Amino acid sequence: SGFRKMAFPSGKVEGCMVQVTCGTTTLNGLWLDDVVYCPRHVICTSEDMLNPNYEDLLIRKSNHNFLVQAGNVQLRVIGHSMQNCVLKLKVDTANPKTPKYKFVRIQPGQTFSVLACYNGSPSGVYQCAMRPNFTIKGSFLNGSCGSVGFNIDYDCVSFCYMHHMELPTGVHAGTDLEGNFYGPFVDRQTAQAAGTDTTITVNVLAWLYAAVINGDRWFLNRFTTTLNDFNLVAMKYNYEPLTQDHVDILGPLSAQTGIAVLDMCASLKELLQNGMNGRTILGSALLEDEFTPFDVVRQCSGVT
Amino acid sequence: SGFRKMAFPSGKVEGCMVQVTCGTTTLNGLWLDDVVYCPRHVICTSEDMLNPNYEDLLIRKSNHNFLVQAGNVQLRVIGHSMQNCVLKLKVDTANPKTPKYKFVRIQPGQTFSVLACYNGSPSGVYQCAMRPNFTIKGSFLNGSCGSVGFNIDYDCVSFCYMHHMELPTGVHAGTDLEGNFYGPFVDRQTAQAAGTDTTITVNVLAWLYAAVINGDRWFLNRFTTTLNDFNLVAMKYNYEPLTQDHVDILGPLSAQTGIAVLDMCASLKELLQNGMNGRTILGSALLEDEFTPFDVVRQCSGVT
Ligand SMILES: *C(=N)c1ncccn1
Numbered sequence: 386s387g388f389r390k391m392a393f394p395s396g397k398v399e400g401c402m403v404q405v406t407c408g409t410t411t412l413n414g415l416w417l418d419d420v421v422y423c424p425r426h427v428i429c430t431s432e433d434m435l436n437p438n439y440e441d442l443l444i445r446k447s448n449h450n451f452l453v454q455a456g457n458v459q460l461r462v463i464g465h466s467m468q469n470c471v472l473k474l475k476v477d478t479a480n481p482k483t484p485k486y487k488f489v490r491i492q493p494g495q496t497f498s499v500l501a502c503y504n505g506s507p508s509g510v511y512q513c514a515m516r517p518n519f520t521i522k523g524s525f526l527n528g529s530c531g532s533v534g535f536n537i538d539y540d541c542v543s544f545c546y547m548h549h550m551e552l553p554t555g556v557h558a559g560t561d562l563e564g565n566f567y568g569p570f571v572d573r574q575t576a577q578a579a580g581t582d583t584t585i586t587v588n589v590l591a592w593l594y595a596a597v598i599n600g601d602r603w604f605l606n607r608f609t610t611t612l613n614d615f616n617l618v619a620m621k622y623n624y625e626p627l628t629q630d631h632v633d634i635l636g637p638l639s640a641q642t643g644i645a646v647l648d649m650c651a652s653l654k655e656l657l658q659n660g661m662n663g664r665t666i667l668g669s670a671l672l673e674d675e676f677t678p679f680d681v682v683r684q685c686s687g688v689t
Numbered sequence: 690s691g692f693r694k695m696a697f698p699s700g701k702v703e704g705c706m707v708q709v710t711c712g713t714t715t716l717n718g719l720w721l722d723d724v725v726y727c728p729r730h731v732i733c734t735s736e737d738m739l740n741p742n743y744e745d746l747l748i749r750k751s752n753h754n755f756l757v758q759a760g761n762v763q764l765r766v767i768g769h770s771m772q773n774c775v776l777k778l779k780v781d782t783a784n785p786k787t788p789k790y791k792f793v794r795i796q797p798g799q800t801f802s803v804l805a806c807y808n809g810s811p812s813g814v815y816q817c818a819m820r821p822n823f824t825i826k827g828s829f830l831n832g833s834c835g836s837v838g839f840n841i842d843y844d845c846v847s848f849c850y851m852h853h854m855e856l857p858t859g860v861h862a863g864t865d866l867e868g869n870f871y872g873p874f875v876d877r878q879t880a881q882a883a884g885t886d887t888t889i890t891v892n893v894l895a896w897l898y899a900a901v902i903n904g905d906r907w908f909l910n911r912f913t914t915t916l917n918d919f920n921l922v923a924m925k926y927n928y929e930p931l932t933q934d935h936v937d938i939l940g941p942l943s944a945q946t947g948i949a950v951l952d953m954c955a956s957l958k959e960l961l962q963n964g965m966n967g968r969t970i971l972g973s974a975l976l977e978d979e980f981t982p983f984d985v986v987r988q989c990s991g992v993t
């Protein structure tokens with residue numbers, strides 16, 4: 386028993402982190418096979434970031450200008466190319482620690498683990514979610530760009546995020562491993578404001594099921610609701626609309642606990658309207674939305 | 690910017706996890722050099738756990754009864770011994786992935802990362818703290834015994850915890866790597882109730898400094914207090930007493946933010962008396978106590 390904000394074991398990803406330097410800028414790269422992936426803003430000076438023309442800046446760069454170091458040994462760069470907002474540095478050596486991997490573009494509400502790195506070295510691992518406004522709330526200092534987000538399915542790492550920037554509000558923006566930003570963000574130092582950070586309703590419901598499984602049951606009420614009634618309340622509280630797809634995804638948790646999804650919605654509806662009254666659920670005084678229904682099943686069953 | 694409950698990168702520890710089976714019981718072991726460490730209750734049937742005599746049960750066990758598997762390859766057990774509540778299984782092969790390591794016994798209030806494992810395989814990593822009542826609030830299912838807690842200092846892993854049991858209240862108890870339980874707990878299936886789970890005051894203060902560094906400043910007030918006045922309030926709210934040692938440890942955070950430790954105590958005093966009023970600090974609606982002052986400095990500086 387017990388329910389924690391758990392990250393995937395990071396070992397498989399640690400074996401892929403390298404340092405990339407271009408001029409005076411050092412950030413992280415991801416070395417998979419004979420390619421090193423990193424944010425293209427590694428070629429920019431802090432000044433260039435104001436209005437960069439990446440194609441033009443890249444013309445002034447040669448393979449020998451990209452310094453790639455894996456541990457304390459230098460990798461030889463034999464090619465370079467830009468794919469959207471990432472640079473792909475072809476090296477002459479395949480990473481011997483390359484795990485089975487995929488590049489996936491996640492949807493909002495999906496969670497992933499981040500291996501925060503500096504100078505190609507791992508500093509920590511934590512669990513995040515792609516917010517509905519396509520930002521993430523991470524922990525990233527200067528030098529952390531190129532740190533990656535991922536999920537693991539037994540032995541295959543699905544990379545879903547690469548860190549590129551912090552908005553003026555302290556929230557984070559980045560790309561998938563094809564270099565496409567999540568959301569409308571651009572790799573430029575300009576006014577970029579995030580939209581409404583709504584709550585991921587299906588994740589809150591999953592976490593309420595995790596609470597019931599783990600013995601925290603005070604919030605269970607005698608009520609039920611409908612998808613339409615619940616959604617009127619969800620709109621009022623800046624919660625994402627709940628769809629029949631979300632109800633179907635919660636089916637296994639509903640089956641395990643014997644609590645119908647709409648009854649759990651009615652419990653959540655009362656928590657939104659009445660508040661927590663100074664009580665906690667799974668050691669939290671707010672409704673947690675960074676556990677997907679899959680994460681709740683995974684953690685409650687001990688998937689390795 | 691951003692502040693997350695961050696665990697250490699788990700790779701160095703993943704390379705040490707093995708599966709240990711005795712009879713019908715399978716749990717995890719930690720393989721360092723040519724020794725595999727595991728909870729001694731691996732020799733018990735669920736029935737034996739009611740009132741086990743470990744020395745007597747161990748007489749009926751031979752080296753060949755302890756099945757140790759690292760990945761999918763079997764290790765040969767050439768010796769076994771009991772040290773307090775852990776078994777040390779001498780194997781004929783040194784773990785080639787043994788990192789630099791130490792065995793440390795932590796004090797309450799100290800944090801560590803847990804690599805939850807099942808069948809010798811890592812499932813997830815999360816951050817914990819040794820509670821003042823010597824329990825931990827983990828996420829452990831059946832089969833997770835032998836999972837370990839650790840801290841990393843650059844390349845040296847300091848192992849501080851090995852999971853042994855869950856109390857009837859869903860909280861966890863375990864030992865250091867010398868087999869000595871934290872707190873008064875015993876490896877027996879009997880009535881073991883935990884004491885008061887007080888709040889780790891010095892960690893809350895560290896987290897308030899982390900909040901100021903990261904821009905969450907609404908709780909800063911115009912007041913100050915004394916150690917004695919603050920402690921009267923701390924006692925009332927089941928917070929641990931703050932000592933001059935804790936004030937000294939918070940010195941670097943006080944210096945960085947320009948907020949005197951006693952002024953931060955006065956802010957915390959008002960938060961305890963007035964509550965949060967529906968507001969949050971670092972995305973939390975409660976006062977977080979599982980970040981030490983060292984963790985706040987580490988995360989705010991990007992130690993790798
Ligand atoms: C990412 N490494 C980064 N560091 C400093 C400024 C901007 N981005």
Ligand SMILES: *C(=N)c1ncccn1
Nearest residue numbers: 716830831832833834
């Ligand atoms: C630890 N692995 C454990 N599993 C089942 C019951 C008790 N302890």
